[PDB]
């Protein structure tokens, strides 16, 4: 969370939270209504957002689903959708928290090791999350689209 | 070269070469004739070895050359053929040297970063070097087959 990140930085410098950190936390807690609403929106559009996200990903790179790809059959494509739902849940976590630390803690540490042990194309995973972000922005309010796009973009950068 | 490796070990220990290193270099210098024979055979049959291994790799993983893939296009399949040529010549260098130092230094260190930059499926490359292993073993003698297989096993494990 943003509060956790500020606390960690203050502890690292061995001091109390600065007025800038305090005002940032104050602004975040005051504006948290919009963040909770957007988390609710993404949770509601979870099923569709995953559906057309995976569809666009497969159309843009069918090799991952084609013969020889990681998720060739419907079974492994279902697993791929399961992972995409994981990452949607992580982005929801990031939106509610306000800071990317939950995302890093849950689904970005050792992710290269995971997707090199699984043989998954990490570039394909990045493209899938990018299509997720595009469809979410399409079905989300523009400014709120940017609010969620910050976390989607961070996950994209870490994946790439 | 195993001579260079033994020299490095001896200089690290600040001592002259031990009987183990002396016996190792003696065995290498006595087997240099067979090693050069294997190198000459690989150099002579390089193109057929690489082409057959690449086609076996294509059959294993058709998506590598499928549309939207890294090898898609005749340019991007000829570049796979070139990479396989590079790795076969590197294996020849390692066989003639007796140690894996040239292989690790020219094709193994930084290879994962290079293939991450280029988007290549290093697992697919490992399958390709495996197929080159079977093809070279078929084209090559049985007694030296184990010797060449050791270096192929090393490369497959490292680049896996």
């Amino acid at each position: 969370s943003i509060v956790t990140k500020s606390i960690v930085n203050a502890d690292a410098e061995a001091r109390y939270l600065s007025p800038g950190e305090l005002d940032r936390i104050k602004a975040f807690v005051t504006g948290g209504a919009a963040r909770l609403r957007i988390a609710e929106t993404l949770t509601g559009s979870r099923e569709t957002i995953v559906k057309q996200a995976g569809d666009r990903l497969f159309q843009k790179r069918p090799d991952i689903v084609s013969p020889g790809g990681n998720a060739y059959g419907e079974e492994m494509t279902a697993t791929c959708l399961r992972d995409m739902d994981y990452y949607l849940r992580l982005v929801t976590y990031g939106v509610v928290s306000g800071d990317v630390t939950p995302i890093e803690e849950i689904g970005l540490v050792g992710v290269r090791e995971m997707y090199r042990s699984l043989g998954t194309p990490i570039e394909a995973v990045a493209q899938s999350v990018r299509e997720m972000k595009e469809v979410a922005s399409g079905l989300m309010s523009s400014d709120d689209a940017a609010e969620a796009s910050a976390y989607f973009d961070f996950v994209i950068g870490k994946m790439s | 070269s195993i001579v260079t490796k033994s020299i490095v070990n001896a200089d690290a220990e600040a001592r002259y070469l031990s009987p183990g290193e002396l016996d190792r270099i003696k065995a290498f210098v006595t087997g240099g004739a067979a090693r050069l024979r294997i190198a000459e055979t690989l150099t002579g049959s390089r193109e057929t070895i690489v082409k057959q291994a690449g086609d076996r790799l294509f059959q294993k993983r058709p998506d590598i050359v499928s549309p939207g893939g890294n090898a898609y296009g005749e340019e991007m399949t000829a570049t796979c053929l070139r990479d396989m040529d590079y790795y076969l010549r590197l294996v020849t260098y390692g066989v003639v040297s007796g140690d894996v130092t040239p292989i690790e230094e020219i094709g193994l260190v930084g290879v994962r970063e290079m293939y991450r930059s280029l988007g290549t499926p290093i697992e697919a490359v490992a399958q390709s070097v495996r197929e080159m292993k079977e093809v070279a073993s078929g084209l090559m003698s049985s007694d030296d087959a184990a010797e060449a297989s050791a270096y192929f096993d090393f490369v497959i494990g490292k680049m896996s």
């Binding site: 013969p67 020889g68 079974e75 | 059959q59 993983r61």
Partner: peptide, 5 residues
């Protein structure tokens, strides 16, 4: 020609 699902 196939890949085990």
């Amino acid at each position: 020609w196939q890949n085990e699902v």
